[PDB]
Amino acid sequence: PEQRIEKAKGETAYLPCKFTLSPEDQGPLDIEWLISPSDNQIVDQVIILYSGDKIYDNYYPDLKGRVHFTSNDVKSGDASINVTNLQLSDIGTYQCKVKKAPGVANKKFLLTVLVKPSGTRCFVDGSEEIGNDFKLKCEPKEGSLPLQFEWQKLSDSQTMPTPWLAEMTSPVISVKNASSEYSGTYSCTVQNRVGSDQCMLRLDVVPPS
Numbered sequence: 001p002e003q004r005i006e007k008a009k010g011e012t013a014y015l016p017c018k019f020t021l022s023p024e025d026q027g028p029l030d031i032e033w034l035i036s037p038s039d040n041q042i043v044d045q046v047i048i049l050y051s052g053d054k055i056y057d058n059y060y061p062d063l064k065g066r067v068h069f070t071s072n073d074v075k076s077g078d079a080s081i082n083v084t085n086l087q088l089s090d091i092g093t094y095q096c097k098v099k100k101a102p103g104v105a106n107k108k109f110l111l112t113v114l115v116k117p118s119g120t121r122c123f124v125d126g127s128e129e130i131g132n133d134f135k136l137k138c139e140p141k142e143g144s145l146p147l148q149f150e151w152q153k154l155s156d157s158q159t160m161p162t163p164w165l166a167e168m169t170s171p172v173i174s175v176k177n178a179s180s181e182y183s184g185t186y187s188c189t190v191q192n193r194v195g196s197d198q199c200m201l202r203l204d205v206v207p208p209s
Contacts, residue, residue: 008194017098019098031051032096034047045060079096116143119197129205160186
């Protein structure tokens with residue numbers, strides 16, 4: 001089991017890792033967390049240890065100061081960690097390895113970090129001319145999937161061209177055989193569960209010449 005944990009950038013991830021001891025488990029309690037980041041191909045890197053009743057946490061410089069055991073009494077049965085001020089670079093697989101010999105247990109977490117849509121650009125791809133085919137595009141610079149789009153007409157009738165109604169919730173509107181009546185100011189609003197962004201374009205459909 002690889003449990004998915006999903007949080008937004010800047011929030012804190014809780015990676016729970018509670019454990020029961022068998023009375024047979026007489027060896028010293030030893031706990032190791034390791035990361036395998038997405039951003040690169042290093043694998044199984046120690047980020048924090050509990051060993052000899054002491055915490056060692058100076059391991060992985062990208063996580064400096066941001067990884068802590070959740071509990072104030074780890075030896076009672078809680079190996080959970082907090083990862084605070086989440087960065088996009090913290091996306092990866094986190095493994096909790098608990099040992100109290102002969103007992104050994106592991107668990108993995110797949111951490112994803114979400115970001116709201118931002119830097120969203122609204123633009124026309126093509127010549128804005130009567131009879132032409134061109135494209136209305138709403139392109140976020142950043143934004144975690146799944147993303148929702150919604151075009152609206154801000155100017156004049158405040159009503160989207162009927163032929164475009166099917167692509168109204170799409171990032172791209174593929175305009176065919178353009179009418180001058182399609183002209184106007186249009187808004188693209190993009191959202192995901194973190195947040196929202198909006199942009200605007202002006203369409204001016206003129207005779208081709």
